[PDB]
Amino acid sequence: LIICETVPGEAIQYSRYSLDRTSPLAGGCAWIEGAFVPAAAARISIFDAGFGHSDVTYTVAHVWHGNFFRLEDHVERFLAGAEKMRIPMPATKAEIMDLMRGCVSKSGLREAAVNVCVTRGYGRKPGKTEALESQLYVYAIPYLWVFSPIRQIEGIDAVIAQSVRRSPANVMDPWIKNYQWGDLVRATFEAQERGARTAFLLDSDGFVTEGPGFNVLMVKDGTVFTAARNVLPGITRRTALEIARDFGLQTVIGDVTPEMLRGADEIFAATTAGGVTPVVALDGAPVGAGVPGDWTRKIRTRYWQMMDEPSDLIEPVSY
Amino acid sequence: LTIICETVPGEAIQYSRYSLDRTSPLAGGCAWIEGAFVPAAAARISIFDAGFGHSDVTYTVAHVWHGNFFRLEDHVERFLAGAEKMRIPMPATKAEIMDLMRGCVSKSGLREAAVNVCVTRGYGRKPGEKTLEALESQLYVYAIPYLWVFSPIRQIEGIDAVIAQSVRRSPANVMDPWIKNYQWGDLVRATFEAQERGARTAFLLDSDGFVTEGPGFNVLMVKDGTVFTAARNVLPGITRRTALEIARDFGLQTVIGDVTPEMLRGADEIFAATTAGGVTPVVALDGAPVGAGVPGDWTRKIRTRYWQMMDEPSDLIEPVSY
Amino acid sequence: QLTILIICETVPGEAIQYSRYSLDRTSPLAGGCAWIEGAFVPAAAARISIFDAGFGHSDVTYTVAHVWHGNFFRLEDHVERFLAGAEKMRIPMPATKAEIMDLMRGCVSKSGLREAAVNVCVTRGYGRKPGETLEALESQLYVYAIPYLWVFSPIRQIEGIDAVIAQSVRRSPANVMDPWIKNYQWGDLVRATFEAQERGARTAFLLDSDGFVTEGPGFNVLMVKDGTVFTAARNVLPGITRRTALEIARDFGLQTVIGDVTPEMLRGADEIFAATTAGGVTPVVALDGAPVGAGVPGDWTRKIRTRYWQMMDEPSDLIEPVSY
Amino acid sequence: QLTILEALIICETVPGEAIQYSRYSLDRTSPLAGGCAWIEGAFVPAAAARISIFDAGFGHSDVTYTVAHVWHGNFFRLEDHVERFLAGAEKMRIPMPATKAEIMDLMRGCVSKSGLREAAVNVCVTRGYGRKPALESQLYVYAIPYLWVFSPIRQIEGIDAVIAQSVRRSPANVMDPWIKNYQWGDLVRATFEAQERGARTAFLLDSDGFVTEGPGFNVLMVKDGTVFTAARNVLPGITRRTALEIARDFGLQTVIGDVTPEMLRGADEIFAATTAGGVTPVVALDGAPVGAGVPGDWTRKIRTRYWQMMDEPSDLIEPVSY
Ligand SMILES: *C(=O)c1c(COP(=O)(O)O)cnc(C)c1O
Ligand SMILES: Cc1ncc(COP(=O)(O)O)c(C=O)c1O
Ligand SMILES: Cc1ncc(COP(=O)(O)O)c(C=O)c1O
Numbered sequence A: 001l002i003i004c005e006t007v008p009g010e011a012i013q014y015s016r017y018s019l020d021r022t023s024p025l026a027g028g029c030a031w032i033e034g035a036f037v038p039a040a041a042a043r044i045s046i047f048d049a050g051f052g053h054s055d056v057t058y059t060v061a062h063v064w065h066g067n068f069f070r071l072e073d074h075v076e077r078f079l080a081g082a083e084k085m086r087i088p089m090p091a092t093k094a095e096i097m098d099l100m101r102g103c104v105s106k107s108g109l110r111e112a113a114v115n116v117c118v119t120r121g122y123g124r125k126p127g128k129t130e131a132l133e134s135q136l137y138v139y140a141i142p143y144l145w146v147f148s149p150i151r152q153i154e155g156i157d158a159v160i161a162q163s164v165r166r167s168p169a170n171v172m173d174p175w176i177k178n179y180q181w182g183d184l185v186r187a188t189f190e191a192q193e194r195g196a197r198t199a200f201l202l203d204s205d206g207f208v209t210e211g212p213g214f215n216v217l218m219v220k221d222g223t224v225f226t227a228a229r230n231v232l233p234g235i236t237r238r239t240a241l242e243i244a245r246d247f248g249l250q251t252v253i254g255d256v257t258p259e260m261l262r263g264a265d266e267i268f269a270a271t272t273a274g275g276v277t278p279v280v281a282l283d284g285a286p287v288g289a290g291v292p293g294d295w296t297r298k299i300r301t302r303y304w305q306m307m308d309e310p311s312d313l314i315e316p317v318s319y
Numbered sequence B: 001l002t003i004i005c006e007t008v009p010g011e012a013i014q015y016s017r018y019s020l021d022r023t024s025p026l027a028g029g030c031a032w033i034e035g036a037f038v039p040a041a042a043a044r045i046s047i048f049d050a051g052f053g054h055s056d057v058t059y060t061v062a063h064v065w066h067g068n069f070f071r072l073e074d075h076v077e078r079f080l081a082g083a084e085k086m087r088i089p090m091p092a093t094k095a096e097i098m099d100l101m102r103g104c105v106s107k108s109g110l111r112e113a114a115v116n117v118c119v120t121r122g123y124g125r126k127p128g129e130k131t132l133e134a135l136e137s138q139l140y141v142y143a144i145p146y147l148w149v150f151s152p153i154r155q156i157e158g159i160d161a162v163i164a165q166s167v168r169r170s171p172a173n174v175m176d177p178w179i180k181n182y183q184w185g186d187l188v189r190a191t192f193e194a195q196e197r198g199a200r201t202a203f204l205l206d207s208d209g210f211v212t213e214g215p216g217f218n219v220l221m222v223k224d225g226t227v228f229t230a231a232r233n234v235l236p237g238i239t240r241r242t243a244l245e246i247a248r249d250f251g252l253q254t255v256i257g258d259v260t261p262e263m264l265r266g267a268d269e270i271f272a273a274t275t276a277g278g279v280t281p282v283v284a285l286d287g288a289p290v291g292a293g294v295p296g297d298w299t300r301k302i303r304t305r306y307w308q309m310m311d312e313p314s315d316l317i318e319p320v321s322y
Numbered sequence C: 001q002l003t004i005l006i007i008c009e010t011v012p013g014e015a016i017q018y019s020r021y022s023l024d025r026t027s028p029l030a031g032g033c034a035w036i037e038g039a040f041v042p043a044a045a046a047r048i049s050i051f052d053a054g055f056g057h058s059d060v061t062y063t064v065a066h067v068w069h070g071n072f073f074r075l076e077d078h079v080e081r082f083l084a085g086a087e088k089m090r091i092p093m094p095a096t097k098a099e100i101m102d103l104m105r106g107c108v109s110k111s112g113l114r115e116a117a118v119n120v121c122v123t124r125g126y127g128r129k130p131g132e133t134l135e136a137l138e139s140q141l142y143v144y145a146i147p148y149l150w151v152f153s154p155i156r157q158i159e160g161i162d163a164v165i166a167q168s169v170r171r172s173p174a175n176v177m178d179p180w181i182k183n184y185q186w187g188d189l190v191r192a193t194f195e196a197q198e199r200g201a202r203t204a205f206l207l208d209s210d211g212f213v214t215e216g217p218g219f220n221v222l223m224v225k226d227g228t229v230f231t232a233a234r235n236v237l238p239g240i241t242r243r244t245a246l247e248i249a250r251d252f253g254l255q256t257v258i259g260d261v262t263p264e265m266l267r268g269a270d271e272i273f274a275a276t277t278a279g280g281v282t283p284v285v286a287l288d289g290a291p292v293g294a295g296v297p298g299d300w301t302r303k304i305r306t307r308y309w310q311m312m313d314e315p316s317d318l319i320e321p322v323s324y
Numbered sequence D: 001q002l003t004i005l006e007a008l009i010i011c012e013t014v015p016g017e018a019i020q021y022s023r024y025s026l027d028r029t030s031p032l033a034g035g036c037a038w039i040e041g042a043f044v045p046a047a048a049a050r051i052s053i054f055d056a057g058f059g060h061s062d063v064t065y066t067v068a069h070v071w072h073g074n075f076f077r078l079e080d081h082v083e084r085f086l087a088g089a090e091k092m093r094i095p096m097p098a099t100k101a102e103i104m105d106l107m108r109g110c111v112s113k114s115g116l117r118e119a120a121v122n123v124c125v126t127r128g129y130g131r132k133p134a135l136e137s138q139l140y141v142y143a144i145p146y147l148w149v150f151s152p153i154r155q156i157e158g159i160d161a162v163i164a165q166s167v168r169r170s171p172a173n174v175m176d177p178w179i180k181n182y183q184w185g186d187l188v189r190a191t192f193e194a195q196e197r198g199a200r201t202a203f204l205l206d207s208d209g210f211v212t213e214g215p216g217f218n219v220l221m222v223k224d225g226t227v228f229t230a231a232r233n234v235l236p237g238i239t240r241r242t243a244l245e246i247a248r249d250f251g252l253q254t255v256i257g258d259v260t261p262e263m264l265r266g267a268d269e270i271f272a273a274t275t276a277g278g279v280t281p282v283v284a285l286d287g288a289p290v291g292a293g294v295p296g297d298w299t300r301k302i303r304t305r306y307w308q309m310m311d312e313p314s315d316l317i318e319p320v321s322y
């Protein structure tokens, strides 16, 4: 089922530096039950209901060129989903941001993926009081790619999965970022069996939702369409839609049919682990012209250039 | 959200009378983690195991009662088959798994225990990676004191339930309940709804409106000489399997097949079945009594025979060598 | 017994009043007139072949446009939705948009009815038409104009109705038979009506597979919360009464959102109302035995209802007087 | 263009095989010869049978029905059909305006007056169009020449099918396929999909991904000596019922229960079952051969036995008095 090669001349470029590895936390740092530890050594109690019940939600913020991107938006969504899942939060928004910034700073990574999750926990904590049994776990590790940097430029192929559907809103809601990947994993297997890189899942009514780790967007005659129901409201998606509106395009978050996809001018995936990815073939047929689309490239370009432009959306890490 | 427990004096559920020597640190609860038997309270897994971040894991729970394993072989076979269906390579043989489970219980000293075994997709190549295609999957095992979904008292006196209206069971073509798994998002939602509606538990319906199971147990009903229980969108429970064997031995018909809410509302009796507690009468449903509103005759006979099977020599029990 | 639905009682002084006139019954078409297989016929004589696939397969779609005070309301909107659904259903249309509107105008005119419901439907047909060619379409267009129909009575339009969220039935999915196409497949909707009756309410709202609010039997469901009007996007007919209510709402300065509606949204709503050509705008004053907001017809609902009926007497691109 | 039935009096059949029409002459001086309906109290020529446009059976599809057939002048399972018909009308809550005996007499009369020795006989009941010219339900009956979903040649040579991916079968908790009904929106969509993909017909899945039925027929499969067919979200067909009786008489096991696409793709044989044509081999599915790719061995024996039952005196047949 640390730094990476990227396309010369294109918008995705790691930082040019070298990491001080005297620190055992350099390269990847987790925070577990009050301790900053080397990511490789980070372990959780097997009795955490985050494991045995998948009673856990999370988000992933990224750092690029030493800048957090939309860290505040991420933690607010993380917090809103934990409230929806009814998991009490054992730390404030400010505290969580500080723990994430601490994991990144300690790791020294300028290109990084920062996971924070909260679990229902494993019962009373070692040692207090009504005191919360929820557990926060954080880690900052090298930036993750669902699709490689080369494919961020050259594009991927996809299928509409036929053997599995996305988890319904009234079973376990994709709106809450969650670790229940049973359907997403099955869809990844199906993609492999059919010779594609990834799969889009349909919901029970047959509408297009998302894929294993990314939102799905399409462009058609000057409008960008993306699903409202049975998907995570991704923050890459939010950015792409803000970019598209700046470019004068219209945006619609609403029901997306497979016929809409098949007729689309352009399709692309969006996720914090990779950014904006052209999808150039669907179910064996070309998407539009079969090459990364015009709007796709100009949205992807703007996305990466934002990593370096001062704005309310970026926050430099203090290392 | 919701070593010895109080039991009802004189009824069929009684713990072993004994003293547990605590000289060994494994006594009271023992886990097997990455090649080592450790005390349960110290059992920890890598946060990077996909069994966590993707719930890429399946498991079973077999129990020990009066120092006897109950249907250990059936549990391991089912566990192995679900792992195959989930496409998780198994890093152990059936015989190996059974010996780790016996070892955890033996080292724990517990005569009444719950024994969990699960396999996850793993966290990448194991430490001491010695080749690329050595299996990355992880097997974790633990034996801890026997767990009760419903208390020993409720096993005798019964519980009340609701049919959930705010959540449905995971469909077979999303993540199949037939594979025992840790994706409890819907089961936890149903637990919250029960609490908000003032009932002990909830039964979930599937997308077509049929009765499936609840949070940690199968649902069975009795009507005019037949025991009915869902086929689709449920775990094929081994407590359910035993209850149906017992029913047929009592002369009743058994039907594994679609169960409707109207069937439940007309039932003579309803009961829950799970390894974590056995056979539990369900005496009220959506605030209305089930049958005569007390534990039914067949439920009580099945429950009694079930616990007696923990003592009676059979192919179903395997005594633990402490 | 099931209750889905020339002059009926209305509330005196309120915005709903029939025309005061005398219908002359000399022409046998007066009071109700259908067009069936090239012929205008009295409504009571209107019959179709039992072998029409619109019956045996429900291979049929339709719309109902209404006449009030002798004015057609949004006739062209209706025929445009009608045609678009028939194309979605792949039923070839045996007439042009213009021809359809003329037939509908014909039926109303010949009926004499100043308050009427005008149904046009197209079926896959019963095979080769009498008098034929494999060339010729087999689809059948049927039309009728009969006295105006009320899902909820004129008095309930003023005083309000009570509803339940159905728990024993769900709305047909988009990938089974799409509610977006107005259709005659009312299996789920009839089940929901019976459940309403069993639970002591006037009607029921159906949820879809994912547990979201859709529509009721013959009407759309709208709600008002803190200055915004909400109504479902998916698994509903895009009603033209709904379309009109939203237009009115935005001219009152309210926001509007067509999109997913949850049961919890409804349970917190300030107001709830139904919308349909067969009766207009209906207050929903109790849901699942609980009061909706204050439990009386709500402020905005009453303004929207009032304005809707006023629009029947206001020349505009939306109303076309009937030539009697 | 929609093709639901391939073969709308006598049709061409495979010489020497089990399906053969009667050789007789129709007395056509009667207006009813060749097709006779009963509508609102009168027998009328089928081609002039018309119903009120205001019948809720049209405007709401508030209607259920069955079709029993006559072969070689014998009604086949007439009583079973009327009993299924009546039970579905009760489930749909449509009052029945005639007795079981009165229905069977009207069906027999329509056949007798038609003179058809091979006939399809439809009986339906609708909610009606209001107070009649008390109870408003309407019964309509017609006997017309026997109808073929698949032609007599393909009853022998077999057909090809696809599993529909563009549409799903109506759920039990929307409009239950268990009640035979005229709501074919989904079945028509599946028929168009079959046509687009170059196959003669399609099988529909339900919400959970299980195999249900097709447009006008049940789906059965054979694997290693057992016949499987869906339980949920299908009509409990009487051809299906007959085929499973024959299978059991032949010594095969029969299982009415959940059928997966994987099971179909693995089957030894697949066949369709319906009153409009009988038992049809399905020799290709999604462009792959079913089993060996020829009409299967058990399919052929069941089909042969089915047609021989049209002539063998038994509780299954009753001769029609013309
Ligand atoms: C029509 O009766 C109908 C509506 C309302 O749509 P209009 O406002 O009349 O266009 C809504 N939902 C259903 C199922 C209907 O049949
Ligand atoms: C299921 C799913 N959809 C979409 C996303 C991406 O959303 P975001 O842009 O906030 O990372 C994720 C992240 O991996 C995801 O898990
Ligand atoms: C969802 C679910 N259903 C049913 C069961 C009961 O199965 P068994 O009797 O094999 O323990 C379990 C727990 O044991 C379960 O988690």
Ligand SMILES: Cc1ncc(COP(=O)(O)O)c(C=O)c1O
Residues within 6 Å of the ligand: D067, D180, D213, D214, D215, D216, D217, D218, D234, D235, D236, D237, D238, D239, D240, D273, D274, D275, D276
């Ligand atoms: C949907 C459906 N399934 C199955 C069947 C077959 O049922 P029977 O064998 O009783 O005719 C029919 C008959 O046309 C049908 O309409």
